[PDB]
Amino acid sequence: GSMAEAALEAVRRALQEFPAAARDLNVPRVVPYLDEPPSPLCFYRDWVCPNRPCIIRNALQHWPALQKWSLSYLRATVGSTEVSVAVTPDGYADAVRGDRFVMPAERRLPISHVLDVLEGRAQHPGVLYVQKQCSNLPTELPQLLSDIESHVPWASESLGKMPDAVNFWLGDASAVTSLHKDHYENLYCVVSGEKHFLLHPPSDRPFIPYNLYTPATYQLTEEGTFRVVDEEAMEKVPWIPLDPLAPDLTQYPSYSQAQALHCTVRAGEMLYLPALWFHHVQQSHGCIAVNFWYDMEYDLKYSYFQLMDTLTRATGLD
Numbered sequence: 001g002s003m004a005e006a007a008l009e010a011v012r013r014a015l016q017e018f019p020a021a022a023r024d025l026n027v028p029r030v031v032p033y034l035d036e037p038p039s040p041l042c043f044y045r046d047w048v049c050p051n052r053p054c055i056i057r058n059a060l061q062h063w064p065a066l067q068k069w070s071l072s073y074l075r076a077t078v079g080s081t082e083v084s085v086a087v088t089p090d091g092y093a094d095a096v097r098g099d100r101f102v103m104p105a106e107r108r109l110p111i112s113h114v115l116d117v118l119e120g121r122a123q124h125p126g127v128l129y130v131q132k133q134c135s136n137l138p139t140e141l142p143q144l145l146s147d148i149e150s151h152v153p154w155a156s157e158s159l160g161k162m163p164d165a166v167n168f169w170l171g172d173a174s175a176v177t178s179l180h181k182d183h184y185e186n187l188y189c190v191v192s193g194e195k196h197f198l199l200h201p202p203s204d205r206p207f208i209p210y211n212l213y214t215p216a217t218y219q220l221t222e223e224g225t226f227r228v229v230d231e232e233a234m235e236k237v238p239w240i241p242l243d244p245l246a247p248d249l250t251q252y253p254s255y256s257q258a259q260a261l262h263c264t265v266r267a268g269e270m271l272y273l274p275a276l277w278f279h280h281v282q283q284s285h286g287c288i289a290v291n292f293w294y295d296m297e298y299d300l301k302y303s304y305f306q307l308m309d310t311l312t313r314a315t316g317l318d
């Protein structure tokens with residue numbers, strides 16, 4: 001009883017010293033750069049396997065998109081094409097608001113209307129963001145495929161597979177993607193503008209809070225009003241209620257024990273965002289990006305993460 005108490009402290013002390021031990025060993029202080037694409041072997045040994053991020057330069061110039069993709073170009077090329085647009089009152093789709101996890105209001109708008117809202121020629125309630133992931137580029141904007149590649153060759157050879165998804169990203173400067181993780185090896189390419197990433201290694205998990213949230217979706221009405229409507233067709237989704245920009249260190253003090261990485265990834269640059277890595281995404285106004293999702297390898301590293309996630313829960317560490 002008094003010994004069960006001291007053992008729990010020994011369990012927590014191990015969990016609380018793990019992120020500092022793991023990051024001293026595996027995680028670099030700053031995000032390193034590659035001047036040109038790595039070899040498939042180098043890419044796997046140096047980055048994929050040890051779960052390390054890096055920005056890769058000079059790997060997107062065989063894409064015509066780098067020279068062509070202006071806001072005017074999208075209008076002239078795919079303006080009349082209708083795409084899925086996220087609409088949110090504040091620019092935070094897929095985020096914790098109050099005691100709800102809130103999903104964006106989805107909209108079928110022409111690209112030209114989206115461009116108008118960004119350019120000032122038109123106005124819209126809330127904030128817009130073309131951010132339907134699940135492979136929106138080949139699905140909704142296939143005409144743009146002729147300006148890019150359908151995959152990243154050297155990485156497809158390295159990971160030994162083809163991308164599960166190729167996504168299109170076009171957003172307002174006020175459109176922000178909150179802290180989360182995916183089970184994908186992510187190669188993030190920006191064609192115009194610039195993306196600002198706040199990264200956390202998966203080993204920082206014991207200092208990053210999760211909770212179970214009743215899910216809901218913004219409903220945009222004719223009066224330009226967003227109302228949070230409960231979706232009673234899905235069990236709670238776990239999400240991070242922490243804003244890394246302005247952390248609530250009174251309620252999540254242990255987040256100060258975690259350390260974030262920062263990197264601005266620019267036009268013609270490619271970021272290797274490793275699987276299970278936490279990221280928080282900001283963008284310049286009218287930023288255009290394309291990312292490739294390769295499904296992660298479900299090996300010991302994944303099983304390990306599941307354990308220590310469960311352990312973080314059982315010890316009430318957050």
Ligand SMILES: O=C(O)CCC(=O)C(=O)O
Nearest residue numbers: 169176177186188281291
């Ligand atoms: O650019 C964003 O807003 C988020 C994109 C993202 O998180 C991803 O790499 O899948």
Ligand code: NI
Nearest residue numbers: 180181182279
């Ligand atoms: Ni993501």
